[PDB]
Amino acid sequence: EIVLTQSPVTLSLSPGERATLSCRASQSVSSYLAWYQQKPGQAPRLLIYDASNRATGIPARFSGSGSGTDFTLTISSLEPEDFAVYYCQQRSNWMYTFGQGTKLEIKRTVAAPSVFIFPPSDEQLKSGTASVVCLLNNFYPREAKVQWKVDNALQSGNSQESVTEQDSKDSTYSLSSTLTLSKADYEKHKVYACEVTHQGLSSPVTKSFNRG
Amino acid sequence: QSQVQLVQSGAEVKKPGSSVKVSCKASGGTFSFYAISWVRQAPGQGLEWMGGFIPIFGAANYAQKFQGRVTITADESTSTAYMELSSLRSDDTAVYYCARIPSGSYYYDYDMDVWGQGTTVTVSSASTKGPSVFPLAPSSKSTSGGTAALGCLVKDYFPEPVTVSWNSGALTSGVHTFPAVLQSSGLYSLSSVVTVPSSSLGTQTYICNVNHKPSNTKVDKKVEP
Amino acid sequence: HRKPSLLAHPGPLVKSEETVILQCWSDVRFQHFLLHREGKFKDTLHLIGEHHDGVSKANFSIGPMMQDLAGTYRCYGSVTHSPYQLSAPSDPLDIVIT
Ligand SMILES: *[C@@H]1O[C@H](CO[C@@H]2O[C@@H](C)[C@@H](O)[C@@H](O)[C@@H]2O)[C@@H](O[C@@H]2O[C@H](CO)[C@@H](O[C@@H]3O[C@H](CO[C@H]4O[C@H](CO)[C@@H](O)[C@H](O)[C@@H]4O[C@@H]4O[C@H](CO)[C@@H](O)[C@H](O)[C@H]4NC(C)=O)[C@@H](O)[C@H](O[C@H]4O[C@H](CO)[C@@H](O)[C@H](O)[C@@H]4O)[C@@H]3O)[C@H](O)[C@H]2NC(C)=O)[C@H](O)[C@H]1NC(C)=O
Numbered sequence: 001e002i003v004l005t006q007s008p009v010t011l012s013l014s015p016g017e018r019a020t021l022s023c024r025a026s027q028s029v030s031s032y033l034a035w036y037q038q039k040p041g042q043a044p045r046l047l048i049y050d051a052s053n054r055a056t057g058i059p060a061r062f063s064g065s066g067s068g069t070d071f072t073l074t075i076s077s078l079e080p081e082d083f084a085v086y087y088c089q090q091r092s093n094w095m096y097t098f099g100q101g102t103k104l105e106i107k108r109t110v111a112a113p114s115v116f117i118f119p120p121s122d123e124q125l126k127s128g129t130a131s132v133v134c135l136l137n138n139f140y141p142r143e144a145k146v147q148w149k150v151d152n153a154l155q156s157g158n159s160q161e162s163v164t165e166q167d168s169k170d171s172t173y174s175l176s177s178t179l180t181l182s183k184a185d186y187e188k189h190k191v192y193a194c195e196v197t198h199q200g201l202s203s204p205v206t207k208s209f210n211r212g
Numbered sequence: 213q214s215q216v217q218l219v220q221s222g223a224e225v226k227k228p229g230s231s232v233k234v235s236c237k238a239s240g241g242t243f244s245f246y247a248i249s250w251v252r253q254a255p256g257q258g259l260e261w262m263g264g265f266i267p268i269f270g271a272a273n274y275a276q277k278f279q280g281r282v283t284i285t286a287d288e289s290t291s292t293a294y295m296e297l298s299s300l301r302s303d304d305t306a307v308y309y310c311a312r313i314p315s316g317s318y319y320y321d322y323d324m325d326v327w328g329q330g331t332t333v334t335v336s337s338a339s340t341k342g343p344s345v346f347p348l349a350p351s352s353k354s355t356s357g358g359t360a361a362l363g364c365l366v367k368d369y370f371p372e373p374v375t376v377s378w379n380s381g382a383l384t385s386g387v388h389t390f391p392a393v394l395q396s397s398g399l400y401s402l403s404s405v406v407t408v409p410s411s412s413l414g415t416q417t418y419i420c421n422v423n424h425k426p427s428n429t430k431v432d433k434k435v436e437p
Numbered sequence: 438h439r440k441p442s443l444l445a446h447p448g449p450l451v452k453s454e455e456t457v458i459l460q461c462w463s464d465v466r467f468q469h470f471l472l473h474r475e476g477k478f479k480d481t482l483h484l485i486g487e488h489h490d491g492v493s494k495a496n497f498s499i500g501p502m503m504q505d506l507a508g509t510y511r512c513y514g515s516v517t518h519s520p521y522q523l524s525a526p527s528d529p530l531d532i533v534i535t
Pocket of ligand 1: 458
């Protein structure tokens with residue numbers, strides 16, 4: 001079956017720059033290629049149909065090109081509203097397979113996170129568990145590494161993190177990692193730390209607490 | 213740009229191994245000689261085509277990953293479309309979409325695509341459970357740079373969605389409500405933090421406003437100690 | 438549900454980068470004319486039938502001839518009463534590149 005592969009995965013460009021996205025098909029679809037845009041929180045919107053024809057109401061800055069296995073979506077003069085996710089979808093021989101997608105994010109100056117750590121609540125400890133939270137606020141690039149260390153021991157499998165979308169003002173991301181431990185294993189130990197590595201950081205930063 | 217509009221059925225919560233049937237009712241037109249395409253997007257993942265139905269040719273084309281558990285159909289009126297998914301697995305927890313697209317080319321008189329609002333389907337062996345709101349107390353460990361961090365943990369909840377607001381919506385700037393995460397328990401959990409001036413930590417009253425499906429509203433004050 | 442008629446002008450055998458007209462008509466007052474191609478890339482083009490003196494016709498214009506627009510062309514017609522229900526397929530017309 002025809003598999004649509006898109007490149008790049010993430011495009012980090014600045015407002016006003018020309019953008020180029022690529023959709024490659026394992027077998028020819030021959031202009032039966034559609035381009036969609038999904039802004040976060042909304043449904044996908046059709047941009048280009050039949051590989052090159054622009055949909056009704058789409059600004060002329062969006063352009064479609066390609067036939068067979070290679071396709072290109074060009075967005076000249078990136079307007080701030082255009083930074084979103086772009087999918088390509090084949091429309092050949094009654095098969096409408098989608099591509100993996102491509103994230104169009106804003107390339108700003110390097111911003112490093114403000115690291116805050118939160119000890120477990122006394123109400124949650126009565127409930128029987130303990131959850132420690134580390135927060136990385138406002139950073140760019142999105143690539144960051146958080147490592148929990150309990151008494152100098154790297155914890156693996158007990159940490160769940162979630163990242164926020166790029167903010168529409170400072171173009172940064174935020175991360176929140178949570179380490180959940182039983183009331184039995186917590187208390188058995190003392191030092192709880194949170195190591196953070198980022199591009200905007202000359203040295204790794206550690207936020208720690210000692211229970212009591 | 214087409215006069216046609218699509219409305220889908222409501223959200224659903226099914227158990228692993230059951231079946232769900234989502235409906236797509238058309239307004240201002242019929243599917244006619246167009247094709248019914250269903251797509252699914254899981255939280256954080258991308259768009260996944262499930263299959264299509266061309267009523268004029270009585271043709272149903274499906275994706276290999278769903279071939280065998282998926283059925284796409286429509287009413288003789290060609291006004292309501294239906295997709296039924298069987299052997300439901302937790303991996304099928306996603307939002308499903310229905311689209312009126314052309315069979316192939318948009319040559320000559322063909323209207324632009326029309327999507328529906330979507331349908332959230334959650335497949336889990338868990339039961340409806342209210343969240344537990346715990347404080348993330350501000351401290352020197354969260355107060356550096358003259359800016360202090362303050363937050364709540366909405367832990368152990370099902371099913372989504374959960375709304376979090378600070379001071380009844382009077383605090384929106386600095387507020388970062390992080391996407392929920394699915395734990396091994398099958399229950400969800402989210403965190404929502406807000407950065408406020410370090411001063412005013414003891415003067416200002418910060419309260420979390422959390423609402424959920426099991427008719428649960430939990431307001432929690434966030435004190436400094 | 439009566440089969441329409443399909444013709445190609447100037448003919449079914451076409452040269453590369455040349456446009457042809459695939460006329461679809463019938464004495465029945467068909468409101469929608471659908472042309473379906475069978476081949477390397479199947480497709481279904483739609484055209485509103487124009488009811489002139491006696492017949493309702495539709496001039497399907499197959500653009501610059503590429504190997505992808507070649508195949509077996511059959512024609513259908515429907516009434517807006519139920520655009521879902523097509524008629525009987527016309528006799529197949531094979532378009533081949535010279
Ligand atoms: C779908 O396509 C139909 C067929 O179009 C033709 O074939 C397609 C494949 C293409 O090649 C087209 O370019 C081609 O036109 C269309 O029907 C035709 O529309 C055209 C354009 O309006 C008509 O051409 C004009 O006809 C005028 C009328 O004269 C004809 O009709 C008289 C009766 O109505 C008849 O008495 C005449 O003898 C004449 O008949 C034509 O004879 C020639 C030669 O034998 C044949 O080749 C035609 O097929 C005959 N047409 C018939 C039988 O209908 C003319 O007056 C007019 O001439 C104009 O231009 C000249 C200069 O070139 C001027 O000098 C003159 O003053 C005038 O301005 C022109 O030829 C054509 O007749 C229509 N019918 C046919 C069968 O071709 C459909 O309209 C189209 N439908 C859609 C929705 O697009």
